[PDB]
Design a protein around this ligand. Structure first.
Ligand SMILES: [Ca+2]
Ligand SMILES: [Ca+2]
Lengths: 146, 95
């Protein structure tokens, strides 16, 4: 919980992803705008709570000092291998740990933001390790998180 | 770089009780858990004749308090992941 000076200049750049008006402070309305642009729908109270756990002076908004301080307490990261495996499992229709290459192409070209058929070709080339037209997604996820 | 790692989720819940409503809810609901646990135990094990309507009453209030506590616990986990979302977004400037 002690920040490198490198990272201080880094989080100032981060601060502007949040301070939608260059105000020098982050309000709940800006935090809601940001949260919603990441696909989340926090309530007004949840936004106030987020600010309130960071707002040292109690003026209802987050300055860069309180922003930068609250990063220092959450620098610890952990791997996402199991969460990514569970996203693949969503498409494991038979729950047998395999997704066919055809089905993975169908998913990647139709759901979410999508990939081009060319992009999906490279992904399946890596994903179908055994060349059998089937993706053992735990093994593929292990390869990508190595 | 960080690759596919994301901010680690918090251990115990020493946080977001800055929300005065949540901490009021926790303490009222916890006290009611204590209250109905006592009253159920007394009414089943410390009496000569069990009054089943009394037990049902305190079972309703007990489940109500337990589930209020659960709903506070889930809200704290949601608040923590909402904050971890912003930490994770801020951390993308370290690359
Ligand atoms: Ca602002
Ligand atoms: Ca402030």
């Amino acid at each position: 919980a002690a920040l490198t000076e490198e990272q201080i200049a880094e989080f100032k750049e981060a601060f502007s992803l949040f301070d939608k008006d260059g105000d020098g402070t982050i309000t709940t309305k800006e935090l809601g705008t940001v949260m919603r642009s990441l696909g989340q729908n926090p309530t007004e109270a949840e936004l106030q709570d987020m600010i309130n756990e960071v707002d040292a002076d109690g003026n209802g908004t987050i300055d860069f000092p309180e922003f930068l301080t609250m990063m220092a307490r959450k620098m610890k990261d952990t791997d996402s291998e199991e969460e990514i495996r569970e996203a693949f499992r969503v498409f494991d229709k038979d729950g047998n740990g395999y997704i066919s290459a055809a089905e993975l192409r169908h998913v990647m070209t139709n759901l979410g933001e999508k990939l081009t058929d060319e992009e999906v070709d490279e992904m399946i080339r890596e994903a179908d390790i055994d060349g059998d037209g089937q993706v053992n997604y735990e093994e593929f996820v292990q390869m990508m998180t190595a | 770089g960080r690759k596919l790692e994301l901010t680690k989720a918090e251990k115990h819940f020493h946080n977001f009780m800055m929300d005065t409503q949540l901490t009021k809810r926790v303490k009222n609901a916890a006290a009611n858990v204590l209250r109905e646990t006592w009253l159920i135990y007394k009414n089943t094990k410390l009496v000569k004749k069990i009054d089943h309507a009394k037990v049902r009453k305190h079972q309703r209030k007990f489940l109500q308090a337990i589930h209020q506590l659960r709903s506070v616990k889930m809200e704290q986990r949601k608040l923590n992941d909402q904050a971890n979302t912003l930490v994770d977004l801020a951390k993308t400037q370290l690359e």
